[PDB]
Design goal:
- This is part of a larger assembly, with 2 copies of chain A.
- By secondary structure, chain A is an alpha/beta fold.
- Chain A contains 19 helices and 15 strands.
- Chain A has helices spanning about 1-5, 20-35, 50-60, 70-90, 110-115, 130-145, 145-155, 170-180, 205-210, 230-235, 265-275, 290-305, 325-335, 340-345, 355-365, 370-385, 395-405, 450-460, 470-485, and strands spanning about 10-15, 40-45, 70, 100, 120-125, 155-160, 185-190, 215-220, 255-260, 285-290, 310, 420-425, 430-440, 460-465, 490.
- In chain A, strands 11-12-10-13-14-9-15 form a 7-stranded parallel beta sheet.
- In chain A, strand 13, helix 18 (about 450-460) and strand 14 (about 460-465) form a beta-alpha-beta unit.
- In chain A, helix 4 packs across helix 6 and helix 4 (about 70-90) packs antiparallel against helix 7 (about 145-155).
- The longest helix of chain A is centred in the N-terminal third of the chain and has 18 residues, at about 70-90.
- Chain A is globular and about 80 Å long.
- The interface between A and B is medium-sized, with 13 and 13 residues.
- Chains A, B: Belongs to the helicase family.
- Chains A, B: This is Gabija protein GajB.
- Chains A, B: GO terms for molecular function: 3'-5' DNA helicase activity; ATP binding; DNA binding; hydrolase activity.
- Chains A, B: Keywords: Antiviral defense, ATP-binding, Helicase, Host-virus interaction, Hydrolase, Nucleotide-binding.
């Protein structure tokens, strides 16, 4: 498992999925290797977005080892291109160059050298599949002897995040550091095609390393690593592929089942005061299938003194290529404390201060109120035109609808609330500490809602409370408990 | 006189001529004002060529006052444009820009801003009469409040050398500092059209200040300021315009006349040992009209133990627009110790390191031996094409002829010799300490050689020795001594 992962000191290839399993293990693996190694060598972690680089830097702590934590583009720029470009190509080339991602697309590698030599800027390649900065960095290393000496002397291992999005030119540099410079590589990626890719992503180079590489040591990560063992056993029994991984335990305490005989508010009081299996001071969230089921529970609790705020699923809450970025644009529009730098951190690459000012100009048109649906669509196209990303028609309408109304404001609110209620689709992504669900929502016999039920069960982190509303739900438990000869998988009050 | 010049603390306009009178007074005026002023304000001296700026910095000494000594282009770049361009035009414009003089000519002021904003370089104007850097610097001062505050706070007086070569845009900035910022200006220039002009020179702006400016205080400099009073009196009596300025002295000791009765070498021994009016340890130089007259004197002295090296006038020794620069190109080719940076210092403006490497590439073709007359002409055109200067046909042939032969090598030699012999045209420029001439060379009755004789007399600095070979020469002295009632103007041995 994870203990076997961190012990390996060689080239490690990690398959990460379900989210957050990659980030926590990455930070723990980095800080553990820093404690083992006392020599002068440092580590280098590279992330596509600037937020992930800042997220890793905050958890690691002091970087007195000289460790580099930053963007993929910022790494090759500050460590390879800028220091040794004059050594590789002569004194004609500048080291005070400014890289602009959006401007100055060129057709050939020879053309881009002239933009850097004469126009004093570092422009991107026109083809999204070919990266000019990494082609330049790899070229500089082969031309410059000092460049190869410095990289070997500075870093002994390099950590790479989200490797499935790396392009071929970006992939060539990483393999060049491992094959020629003999630098250890810790690779984290998602083998599934998924929904999120960098504009020049090719999953085959990552998939090819899993199939034909003898140097790397392959590992895998559990999807529900953060969930406790008792919650994992209750979640995995509903899907046939997941039933094999769980192991039975002599005593089960985290998953509680209680039949709904008293009103909904009384069940909440019973679990909080009579058995104290749920703490009122800990965050508590309740699961529903539809928005109406959440409203009636929220209104029933306001009468009993319980205070709650309910997050609804927005039109943007849909598996689309630009869903993650579109939500961040909404968070910058809705919230005043959300800085433009926080929005730029979500954008791939380390944008310059001048490029940030141009993107800020496009979005400032959305900060004026009551300017109708047509202008919101053009600002959105103008925004994504600079990023060279086309926008889905339903993604545009979903973005527009959220901008018009204040209905989905708290779903993108920066503030955090202790007690909430969310829909199964509302928080498909984020995870909660303790969750209560009801059985009548999910049809378990024909597996229509088993995927929504599996998501519902995996959201809870410490304690999961299940209400046995449906007899067919309880029958599917008792039937499969006999197939697997499981005496206890649930704790009933 | 000069004592009246340095005492004035206001705006001073100086008319300088005959050479070297401008540089010595400029350094003395600067260091004297630094001693008078104890406050934090500094001075700023600007010269067109980098050699003149380095020449002033060496004589001044320590610049702990923060005084700026450099090029006109380097002044507006480091003090106005680079610090306050972002304040004047916004954060879009860079402060790490690189100015290239030869590349990126543009037609309109708006076009050059885009080259600086996007292409990150500072290019020159296509029209030689219009300067873009000074148009940019003046524009930045009007746009930026801090820029005006810094210039007033830093400098209380600004010294300007060779003002007749300043263009109109360069002239507008200097007047803007005097009229708006109320900064004292010490201006040195030559009112005569002369032979040497910067490619965008307009003498009218300098001439216009002499005619219509009430703020400036006009002054004049003597042509033979370095020569002693006795030598000045002997030189000025031959030309009618010059006879009025000299004043008689009761005793004359510097100008010696001796009739040539003994051989030439014996006259040299007689003056050195019998009267000791010439020191063998001091530099001694003899004047002739033709090259044959110098050879026979040089050969006659080698027999008597006297050792001499004779500098001949080169084909480049001719009043042409590019004579000064062409000689420096020869000095870089002939001498190995003469650095390429010394050649770049003679070029107008502060050339960048990359621009220096391109000029060095063009001249390196002349360093190979025996490559005939045709290739020398093309390298010369290629050299001056970068400087945007056309070359006279006779200037090209004069440059070529010197390159072929080693005959004129010592005339451009970096080494310096104590005892020499030079032609009247050989050292029309440089001045010598003690000079001996002969009377038979100059026809004084019809004033054919009075200009060459006046040059001959003005070369000597401390002691001048005249040989009375011609009776017509001595008669013209005695005749004019009676017209002016001068009892003594010459010391006869």
């Amino acid at each position: 498992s994870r203990e076997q992962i961190i012990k390996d000191g060689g080239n490690i290839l990690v398959t990460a999925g379900a989210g957050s399993g990659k980030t926590t293990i990455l930070v723990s693996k980095i800080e553990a290797d820093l404690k083992e190694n006392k020599t002068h060598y440092s580590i280098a972690a590279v992330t596509f977005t600037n937020k992930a680089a800042k997220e890793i830097e905050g958890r690691l702590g002091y970087s007195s080892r000289g460790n580099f934590i930053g963007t993929n583009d910022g790494f090759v720029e500050s460590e390879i291109i800028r220091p040794f470009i004059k050594d590789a190509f002569g004194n004609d080339y500048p080291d005070n160059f400014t890289a602009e991602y959006f401007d100055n697309q060129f057709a050939s590698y020879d053309k881009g050298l002239q933009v850097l030599k004469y126009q004093n800027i570092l422009g991107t390649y026109s083809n999204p599949k070919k990266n000019f900065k990494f082609q330049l960095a790899l070229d500089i290393l082969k031309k410059s002897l000092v460049a190869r000496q410095y990289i070997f002397s500075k870093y002994f291992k390099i950590f790479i995040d989200e490797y499935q999005d790396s392009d071929k030119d970006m992939h060539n540099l990483f393999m060049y550091l491992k094959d020629q410079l003999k630098i250890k590589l810790f690779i984290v990626g998602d083998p599934k095609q998924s929904i999120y890719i960098w504009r020049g992503a090719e999953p085959e180079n990552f998939n090819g390393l899993i199939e034909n590489s003898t140097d790397f040591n392959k590992y895998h990560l559990t999807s529900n690593f953060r969930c406790c063992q008792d919650i994992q056993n209750y979640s995995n029994l509903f899907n046939e592929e997941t039933r094999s991984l769980i192991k039975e335990k002599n005593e089960v305490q985290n998953v509680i089942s209680i039949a709904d005989d008293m009103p909904i508010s009384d069940i909440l009081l019973k679990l909080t005061e009579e058995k104290q299996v749920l703490n009122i001071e800990a965050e508590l969230v309740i699961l529903v299938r539809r928005r109406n089921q959440a409203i009636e529970i929220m209104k029933e609790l306001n009468e009993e003194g319980f205070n709650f705020i309910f997050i609804p699923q927005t039109p943007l809450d849909r598996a689309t290529p630009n869903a993650t970025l579109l939500k961040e644009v909404i968070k910058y529009v809705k919230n005043d404390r959300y800085s433009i730098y926080d929005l730029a951190a979500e954008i791939v690459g380390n944008l310059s201060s001048r490029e940030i000012k141009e993107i800020q100009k496009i979005i400032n048109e959305l900060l004026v109120p009551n300017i109708n649906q047509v202008l919101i669509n053009q600002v959105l196209i103008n925004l994504f035109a600079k990023l060279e990303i086309t926008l889905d028609t339903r993604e545009i309408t979903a973005f527009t609808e959220v901008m018009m109304t204040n209905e989905f404001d708290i779903a993108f609110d920066t503030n955090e609330y202790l007690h909430k209620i969310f829909t199964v689709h509302s928080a498909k992504g984020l995870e909660f500490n303790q969750v209560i669900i009801t059985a009548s929502d999910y049809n378990v016999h024909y597996n229509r809602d088993t995927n929504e039920h599996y998501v519902a069960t995996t959201r809870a982190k410490d304690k999961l409370i299940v209400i046995m509303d449906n007899k067919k739900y309880s029958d599917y438990i008792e039937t499969l408990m006999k197939e697997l000869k499981i005496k206890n998988i649930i704790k009933s009050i």
